[PDB]
Amino acid sequence: ELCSSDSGTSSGLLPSDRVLWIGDVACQPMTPIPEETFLELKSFSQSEFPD
Amino acid sequence: PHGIIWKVSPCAAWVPSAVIELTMPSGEVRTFHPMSGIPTQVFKGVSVTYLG
């Protein structure tokens, strides 16, 4: 919730283990699609999760 | 040397089937081949199947 003081961060050089990536996600180049397909996909998605 | 290629698919059911040219109310028109009791790759909710 808050940023507390840390003595190990005074040197200015932090190792790589102090960096966390929430979730496994990869990106890629995309292609634009019409609004009708996106609307149908959104409708099917919101219908797949009625709760 | 020649390179003759064959494609064999064994089957022992011989169930009736048909073609379906479905048109969505939005405007999309596609076609698919349903089987007798087998799903036909449901296209956004519609899972119409064929019976014999």
Closest CA to B49 of B6, B1, B17: B17
Closest CA to B28 of A45, A44, A49: A44
Cβ partners under 8 Å of residue B21, min gap 6 = B29, B31
* Contact (CB<8Å) A36/B44: no
| Nearest-angstrom CA–CA distance, A28 and B34 | 34
| Nearest-angstrom CA–CA distance, B45 and B48 | 9
Q: If you search the block for the tokens 């990106």, which residue do you land on? A: A27
Q: Which two tokens stand for residue A23?
A: 């979730």
Closest CA to B26 of A49, A35, A45, A47: A35
Residues of B in contact with A47 (CB under 8 A): 45
Q: 10 Å Cβ neighbour count for B32?
A: 14
Q: If you search the block for the tokens 């003759």, which residue do you land on? A: B4
Q: 10 Å Cβ neighbour count for B34?
A: 19
Q: Resolution of the coordinates in A?
A: 5.2
Residues of B in contact with A42 (CB under 8 A): none
Q: Which stretches of B1-52 are assigned E, i.e. beta strand?
A: 20-23, 29-32
| Nearest-angstrom CA–CA distance, B31 and B22 | 6
Helices (H), chain A: 35-48
